[PDB]
Amino acid sequence: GIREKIKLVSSAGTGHFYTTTKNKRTKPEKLELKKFDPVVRQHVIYKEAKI
Amino acid sequence: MKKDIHPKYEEITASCSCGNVMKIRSTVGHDLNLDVCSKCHPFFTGKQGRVDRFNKRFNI
Amino acid sequence: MLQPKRTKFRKMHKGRNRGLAQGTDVSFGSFGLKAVGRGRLTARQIEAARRAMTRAVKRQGKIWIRVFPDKPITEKPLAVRMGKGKGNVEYWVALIQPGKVLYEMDGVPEELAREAFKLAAAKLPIKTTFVTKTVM
Amino acid sequence: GSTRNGRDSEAKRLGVKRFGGESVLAGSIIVRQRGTKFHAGANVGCGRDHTLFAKADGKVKFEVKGPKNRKFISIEAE
Amino acid sequence: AKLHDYYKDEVVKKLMTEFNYNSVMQVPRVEKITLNMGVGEAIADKKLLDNAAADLAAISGQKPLITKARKSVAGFKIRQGYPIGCKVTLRGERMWEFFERLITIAVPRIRDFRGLSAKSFDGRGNYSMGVREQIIFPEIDYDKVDRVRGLDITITTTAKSDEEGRALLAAFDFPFR
Amino acid sequence: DKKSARIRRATRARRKLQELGATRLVVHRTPRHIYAQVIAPNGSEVLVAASTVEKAIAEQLKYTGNKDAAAAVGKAVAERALEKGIKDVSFDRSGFQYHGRVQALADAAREAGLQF
RNA sequence: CGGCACGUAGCGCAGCGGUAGCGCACCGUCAUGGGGUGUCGGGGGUCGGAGGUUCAAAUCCUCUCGUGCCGACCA
RNA sequence: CCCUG
RNA sequence: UGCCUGGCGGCCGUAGCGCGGUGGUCCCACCUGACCCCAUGCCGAACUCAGAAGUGAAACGCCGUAGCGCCGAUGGUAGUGUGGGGUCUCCCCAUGCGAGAGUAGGGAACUGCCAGGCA
RNA sequence: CCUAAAGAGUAACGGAGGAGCACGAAGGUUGGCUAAUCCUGGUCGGACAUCAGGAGGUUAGUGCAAUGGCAUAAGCCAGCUUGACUGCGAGCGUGACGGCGCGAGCAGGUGCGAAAGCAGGUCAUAGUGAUCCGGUGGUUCUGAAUGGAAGGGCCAUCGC
RNA sequence: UCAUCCCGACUUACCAACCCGAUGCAAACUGCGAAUACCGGAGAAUGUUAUCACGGGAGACACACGGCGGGUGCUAACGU
Ligand SMILES: [Mg+2]
Ligand SMILES: [Mg+2]
Ligand SMILES: [Mg+2]
Ligand SMILES: [Mg+2]
Ligand SMILES: [Mg+2]
Ligand SMILES: [Mg+2]
Ligand SMILES: [Mg+2]
Ligand SMILES: [Mg+2]
Ligand SMILES: [Mg+2]
Ligand SMILES: [Mg+2]
Ligand SMILES: [Mg+2]
Ligand SMILES: [Mg+2]
Ligand SMILES: [Mg+2]
Ligand SMILES: [Mg+2]
Ligand SMILES: [Mg+2]
Ligand SMILES: [Mg+2]
Ligand SMILES: [Mg+2]
Ligand SMILES: [Mg+2]
Ligand SMILES: [Mg+2]
Ligand SMILES: [Mg+2]
Ligand SMILES: [Zn+2]
């Protein structure tokens, strides 16, 4: 209900993004996770971006 | 014992007024002057009637 | 009028009454009224029988009631179509098989106990009989 | 009147799928269950909803083992 | 430390004498001494808990646990895991220095002191006691205190019964009445 | 108590190794002595054993409960395991922390030839 | 008979997870020759009953017995 | 505003 | 070869509790210290390390003891498949299977590998 | 969950309860720990706050209903992290079908651990919506004379 | 009821927690537990392949009673 969708876009600049859900009421700060990126084959920083 | 969180702690001389000195490892730093110790408390040393008051009051 | 003080569930299935009862022995007292037929006993029937026993004997001896009406019975109110939910709870019964020692008593002479059991059996809806404590 | 009941769920088709003494292929489901009613023994894996599957071919075989008397399923290799 | 020397030099053989044991370590020891101070008004103000923790650090020479609520209780308006107490545990040479401090400074300084109750044992040889005013303690000074406060003391020992514990404490000349 | 606590700690690793079916290099540590056994995957038959209570180790070692004891018994169990022909074992700390004497044991075995 | 609305101080009424509130009324003192009106200052409630969850229940749920309303229709 | 017949 | 001890298993209460006794040459445990390796949301309590003065107190092992827990017959009873039958809410007969509870009784475990001490 | 007749399945306006979520830690690993309740003792502190000891043995707990689980803990605590990965998938369960679910193993890269190893979300089972029509980003895959472009396709994803 | 500040002392018309002993009951109880049933393997006989797969054509998806196990109803109904 209160969790809304966000996309984690890569810092490799290839425009590849995962999508998760987030509770912005509890945690206003952004989300950065080192996750696998399939086009650059490296575990790279995925940072929060709006839908 | 960790390091750098416990309160600061050295040896201190203490002196009780009955002529007593003792050697105590503590935190206040300065030496201690003591009112009463275990060697001079009345309980520790052990130093801790109507008809008689009537007779002494109104003796005949 | 006997009734459990609280129960896990408000309504219960109809069930069956097959088999022969245990508790077929006189346990506490000496002289017992034991069922021979098979059927249900309303808590009202239990109360009426117990009253008949105690006021026939006039408060000597002691009376044990070896059955308890734990089973709720529903009845649908009149002029109501079939279905639309199980009916409301109406009274409580105890399923009694043959050979169930229903009532038990002690401290009383034999003829008086037999007479009191005769009044009790007249109030009961099922076949009963008189039994005596055996040492084994 | 009206009822507050009338709800139920679809049945989940639990239970033992391959009984004692079956010949099983690799990856075949032995038991679907809620929790480890049956525990995994040799050559048996326990998938994330506690589904017991055969990690290798062979003959499936039930046992009781352990100090707490638990049912274990194993695959005795053919 | 000198109390430990007193123990190892005379108290063990004295215990041997009046109890007729078979072992010098049938002679009981002091297992631990823990100091508690329940500061349950922290729900009203958490800062006085910090002041109290500083005071208990001052007496103990040791940083205390800020212990939290085990289970939420309606009557005292506490939630589970809320910091409402302070505690230290004392072992070894710290037993002996703090016990020396207590038995040779603090119990002479108790206001209207008449001795301690010998019935304060818990039935298993362990002793407990309650101090009402920490100002009887010279580890804290008079005019820098904020609130009157007390604490409670437990000496847990390996003694198997109350008579064993009271015999040990009488060997240390603990003021029973 | 401490023995049952150590057994409870070791049970997870021991059943994991028993399910994997690997030969086990089990350590047992006492304040005075240390013992090490390489045992079969069946869990009932040992392959080799080495301990500080043996004369052929205690005669040249000074004290039996130190890092030197751990290193010597690790060296010894390593060559007897190699000459019996294992080359491949999985470690079993048996609830002891992987630190100090147990660590010195494992390092001695690893440097003296076992890979784990 | 089926819903759905409410049981709050002596009375009339708000409040519908942690606090019980307003008015009339009662009491005490002033003002009056005295009463009323007026002025000052107080108190008063198992929150309808019972039991279930929750750290906690007036507030959430179930049943209960009261009062009100809307329907108990085609034949 | 009122003042028991 | 025998006894004792430790480790790892088999087995999962006939094996577990209780009560009484017994052991420290070796082993084990308690233990002695801990500025150091490491550690305590405080404490060398635990964990870790360096040792070996003392103790088998606790622990642990062993032995004895049914006060229990546990196992457990034979027969009987309940139930039930199949075929028939009745007074058909429930029972009966032929036949096959055959409980649970309880009783007599059993029962204070047995065993494999390695290592150490003594004989 | 029961009805449901000891495989599965099985109806009723049959009997009882829940959901339309939550969490970047409440996930991964490593390491450690064990509950409820009661009694005794103790300053405010009382029946119940904190501490010590004893009995007890999961009668606790599980983010939320019930059932089945759980001590090797799936329960509690701390350190480090992002496997809540990408392309696949032997085989199997379950559905009339659309579908749903389990899954060893392979390749790339990673986290934890000394390593053996574990990790493709949470103890499991609820927490959800086909298709069309569009919207956003990438991919020349196509591109109505040719080069582009629009539009379309594919991949990711959004709006009942 | 006696003393009634803390204390404390009596009797129960009495009510009774825990535990122990004994007797029952449960669809939503299980420290036990069948008969049947169901899955699989081997074996002999019998059966007009009775089995499975694919393709052509359907019909049917209003059932009734009786037996046994049950829910519901009144263990009422030629009820459901
Ligand atoms: Mg009309
Ligand atoms: Mg008038
Ligand atoms: Mg130590
Ligand atoms: Mg002993
Ligand atoms: Mg039997
Ligand atoms: Mg024994
Ligand atoms: Mg079934
Ligand atoms: Mg069936
Ligand atoms: Mg069908
Ligand atoms: Mg672990
Ligand atoms: Mg977890
Ligand atoms: Mg979780
Ligand atoms: Mg869950
Ligand atoms: Mg063109
Ligand atoms: Mg053109
Ligand atoms: Mg496009
Ligand atoms: Mg139709
Ligand atoms: Mg139909
Ligand atoms: Mg039909
Ligand atoms: Mg019909
Ligand atoms: Zn003095």
Side-chain angles (χ1 to χ4, degrees), chain A:
Chain A
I2 62 170
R3 255 173 183 282
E4 320 208 319
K5 293 177 292 294
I6 62 170
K7 45 202 281 203
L8 282 72
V9 65
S10 168
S11 74
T14 61
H16 177 270
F17 64 100
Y18 287 167
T19 177
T20 61
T21 54
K22 188 183 172 30
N23 198 337
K24 283 62 61 173
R25 314 311 281 300
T26 61
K27 294 181 176 67
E29 71 275 29
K30 277 74 69 177
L31 183 63
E32 293 83 3
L33 294 174
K34 173 162 321 188
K35 298 185 77 104
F36 182 75
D37 184 318
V39 298
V40 298
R41 311 279 263 178
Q42 295 298 109
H43 271 86
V44 66
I45 301 299
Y46 272 109
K47 64 162 52 44
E48 188 176 339
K50 299 298 293 295
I51 301 299

Side-chain angles (χ1 to χ4, degrees), chain F residues 21-56:
Chain F
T23 76
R24 287 162 43 202
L25 188 153
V26 167
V27 64
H28 179 241
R29 181 180 64 75
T30 81
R32 186 165 268 91
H33 295 287
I34 191 167
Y35 314 80
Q37 313 174 230
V38 176
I39 65 171
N42 63 7
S44 64
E45 182 65 26
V46 303
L47 272 295
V48 298
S51 57
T52 61
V53 298
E54 314 213 354
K55 284 63 61 173

Side-chain angles (χ1 to χ4, degrees), chain B residues 1-3 5-6:
Chain B
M1 280 314 81
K2 313 282 182 273
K3 54 212 71 163
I5 62 170
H6 288 340

Side-chain angles (χ1 to χ4, degrees), chain C residues 8 11 13-16 22 66 70 86-87 100:
Chain C
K8 199 141 48 66
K11 324 205 178 171
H13 279 334
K14 189 183 301 279
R16 299 287 171 268
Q22 65 183 357
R66 293 268 309 288
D70 72 345
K86 195 160 160 80
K100 186 95 170 145

